[PDB]
C-alpha cells in the first residue's frame, strides 16, 4: 500500500465500544512484542487543557536534550501530526511501514481468532507505542483519548500522570456529574506514581484525594504546591512567573494567549520537573525557558498573517468562546471582523453583542442544519474587500480553523 491506501485503511476499522477492559488492544500489543511495557511515559488527560499541557511538557523536555515522542489529537494540517518525535510528524514512508507491520500482526491474530478485530483509535494507539519503541524515544507524552480509566492508551505505567481539569464537556460518554466524570480520569493514577493536577472543583478534588490515598501517590495541585504569582500580556503572548516548592522562575514567556493557558503551562513546568527528578535527569530554568518560548499551539488564537492581519482559533463552546471575547478584547482596541462557524444561536449573541462586523458561515465537513455567508471564503473576501486594513479573526470550530490554516499556509 501507498500512504493514501494506508491512511484510508486505518479509517476503515469498525465501530466497536463498551469495553471496561483493554483485552482487544492488549491482544494486539502482545503480538507487537508488548512495546507499551518498555520505555518511559507521561500520561495526560483533562477535559480542557490536556492538549496544551502535553505540548508544553514535550517542548521543555526536548529543549533539555531528550528525544520525546508525542501522541495527541486531533490533527490540524495532516494525520501524521498525531504521532510526533521531537515535534516532527511521522514521515509518510515511515507510516507506510508501521501500518504494514501492525497489519501483518493483526492478520496473524485473525487467523487464530476469526472474529478478532480492533477499533480505529486502538489500532492507532497500538501503532504509536510500537513506533515510539522502534525509534527508541527517551519518553513519550501520551494524551488520553477521552476520560482515562477505559481509554485505549490506559495500558501503561507512567513516570508521572497529569490531570488538567474536569468539566461537563464529555458528559455524554463519561457521566452526568463531575463526580462520575472524575472517577474516569482518576483511572490513569497508578500506585506510587505522582500526579499533577490543576485546581479541580470540589467534587473532582474529592475523587482524586481518595484515589491517591489508595495508590499512596504524591499529589501536586495548582495553587497549592505550585502557582503563577504574576502574569500579563506581552505582545502576542504572556509574560509570567512560575513558583513552586523550589522557588521562582520569573519572567518566563510563552507565545500563547489566554489567561487559562497560565495554569496549563504551570502544570507542564511542574510536571516536567517531576519527571526530571523521578528519573534523575537534569532540567534547568534555561531549558524550561527556551522550551516554552517555542510552545506554539497551532490553530489556537494563532496570528497566521500580519498584513492583512488574520487570526485563527479553535474556540468551541459558549464558555469556550467566552474566554475569547475577553481575549480579543485585550489584544485589540480597534474594530475587527469576526468570522464564526458555530453550531448555537446562543453564542451568536455573545459575538454580535461584542464586535462591529461579524459573519456567520458554515463549518466545513458538517451538514447544513436549520451576518450570513455561504463559506468562510466568501466572508473573508467580502471583509478584505470592504475594509482591507481591518483585522479578521476566524473562530467557532477546530475544523474550520484547521481548514483555513491548510489553505492559507499549506
Curated annotation (Swiss-Prot):
Residues with N6-carboxylysine modification: 185
Disulphides: none
EC number, UniProt record: 6.3.2.17
Residues engaged in binding Mg(2+) 1: 73, 143
InterPro entries: Folylpolyglutamate_synth, Folylpolyglutamate_synth_CS, Mur-like_cat_sf, Mur_ligase_C, Mur_ligase_C_dom_sf, Mur_ligase_cen
A Pfam family that the UniProt record links to this protein: Mur_ligase_C
Residues involved in (6R)-5,10-methylenetetrahydrofolyl-(gamma-L-Glu)n binding: 75, 82, 402
Gene Ontology BP terms: one-carbon metabolic process
pH dependence comment: Optimum pH is about 10.
Activity modulation: Competitively inhibited by adenosine 5'-(3-thio)triphosphate and beta,gamma-methylene-ATP.
Cellular compartments per GO CC: cytoplasm
Gene Ontology MF: a single term: metal ion binding
Keywords assigned: ATP-binding, Ligase, Magnesium, Metal-binding, Nucleotide-binding, One-carbon metabolism
Known cofactor(s): Mg(2+)
Co-factor binding comment: Binds 2 Mg(2+) ions per subunit.
Annotated binding of ATP, by residue: 49-52, 264, 300, 313-316
The protein's enzyme class: ligase
Catalysed reactions, as listed in the record: (6S)-5,6,7,8-tetrahydrofolyl-(gamma-L-Glu)(n) + L-glutamate + ATP = (6S)-5,6,7,8-tetrahydrofolyl-(gamma-L-Glu)(n+1) + ADP + phosphate + H(+); (6R)-5,10-methylenetetrahydrofolyl-(gamma-L-Glu)(n) + L-glutamate + ATP = (6R)-5,10-methylenetetrahydrofolyl-(gamma-L-Glu)(n+1) + ADP + phosphate + H(+); 10-formyltetrahydrofolyl-(gamma-L-Glu)(n) + L-glutamate + ATP = 10-formyltetrahydrofolyl-(gamma-L-Glu)(n+1) + ADP + phosphate + H(+)
Membrane-crossing segments per the record: none
Residues noted as binding Mg(2+) 2 in the record, renumbered to the chain: 170
Subunit structure: Monomer.
Function: Involved in the conversion of folates to polyglutamate derivatives, and likely functions in the retention of cellular folate pools. Catalyzes successive MgATP-dependent additions of glutamate to a pteroylmonoglutamate substrate, with a high preference for 5,10-methylenetetrahydrofolate (mTHF). Thus, metabolizes mTHF to the tetraglutamate derivative, but longer glutamate chain length products are not observed. Tetrahydrofolate (H4PteGlu) and 10-formyl-H4PteGlu are poorer folate substrates. In contrast to E.coli FolC, this enzyme does not display dihydrofolate synthase activity.
PANTHER family in the cross-refs: DIHYDROFOLATE SYNTHETASE-RELATED (PTHR11136:SF0), FOLYLPOLYGLUTAMATE SYNTHASE-RELATED (PTHR11136)
Family: Belongs to the folylpolyglutamate synthase family.
Protein name in UniProt: Folylpolyglutamate synthase
Amino acid at each position: 500500500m501507498n500512504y493514501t491506501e494506508t491512511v484510508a485503511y486505518i479509517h476503515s476499522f469498525p465501530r466497536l465500544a463498551k469495553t471496561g477492559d483493554h483485552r482487544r488492544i492488549l491482544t494486539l500489543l502482545h503480538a507487537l512484542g508488548n512495546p507499551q511495557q518498555q520505555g518511559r511515559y507521561i500520561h495526560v488527560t483533562g477535559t480542557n487543557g490536556k492538549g496544551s499541557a502535553a505540548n508544553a511538557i514535550a517542548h521543555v523536555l526536548e529543549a533539555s536534550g531528550l528525544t520525546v515522542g508525542l501522541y495527541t489529537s486531533p490533527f490540524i494540517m495532516r494525520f501524521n501530526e498525531r504521532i510526533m518525535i521531537d515535534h516532527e510528524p511521522i514521515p509518510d514512508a515511515a507510516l507506510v511501514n508501521a501500518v504494514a507491520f501492525v497489519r501483518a500482526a493483526l492478520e496473524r491474530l485473525q487467523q487464530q481468532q476469526a472474529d478478532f478485530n480492533v477499533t480505529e483509535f486502538e489500532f492507532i494507539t497500538a501503532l504509536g507505542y510500537w513506533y515510539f519503541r522502534q525509534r527508541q524515544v527517551d519518553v513519550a507524552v501520551i494524551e488520553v483519548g477521552i476520560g482515562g480509566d477505559t481509554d485505549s492508551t490506559n495500558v501503561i505505567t507512567p513516570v508521572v500522570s497529569v490531570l488538567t481539569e474536569v468539566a461537563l464537556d464529555h458528559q455524554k460518554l463519561l457521566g452526568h456529574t463531575i463526580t462520575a466524570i472524575a472517577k474516569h480520569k482518576a483511572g490513569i493514577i497508578k500506585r506510587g506514581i505522582p500526579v499533577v493536577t490543576g485546581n479541580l472543583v470540589p467534587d473532582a478534588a474529592a475523587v482524586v484525594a481518595a484515589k491517591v490515598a489508595t495508590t499512596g501517590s504524591q499529589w501536586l495541585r495548582f495553587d497549592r504546591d505550585f502557582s503563577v504569582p504574576k502574569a500579563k500580556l506581552h505582545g502576542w503572548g504572556q509574560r509570567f512567573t512560575y513558583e513552586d516548592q523550589d522557588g521562582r522562575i520569573s519572567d518566563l514567556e510563552v507565545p500563547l494567549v489566554g489567561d487559562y493557558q497560565q495554569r496549563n503551562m504551570a502544570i507542564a513546568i511542574q510536571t516536567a520537573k517531576v519527571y526530571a527528578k523521578q528519573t534523575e535527569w537534569p532540567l534547568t530554568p534555561q531549558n524550561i525557558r527556551q522550551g516554552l518560548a517555542a510552545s506554539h499551539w497551532p490553530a489556537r488564537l494563532e496570528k497566521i498573517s500580519d498584513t492583512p492581519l488574520i487570526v485563527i482559533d479553535g474556540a468551541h463552546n459558549p464558555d469556550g468562546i467566552n474566554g475569547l471575547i475577553t481575549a480579543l478584547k485585550q489584544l485589540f482596541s480597534q474594530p475587527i471582523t469576526v468570522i464564526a462557524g458555530i453550531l448555537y444561536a446562543a453564542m451568536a449573541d455573545r459575538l454580535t453583542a461584542a464586535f462591529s462586523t461579524v459573519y456567520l458561515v458554515p463549518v466545513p465537513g458538517t451538514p447544513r442544519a436549520l451576518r450570513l455567508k455561504d463559506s468562510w471564503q466568501e466572508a473573508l473576501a467580502a471583509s478584505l474587500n470592504d475594509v482591507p486594513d481591518q483585522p479578521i479573526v476566524i473562530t467557532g470550530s477546530l475544523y474550520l480553523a484547521s481548514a483555513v490554516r491548510q489553505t492559507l499556509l499549506g
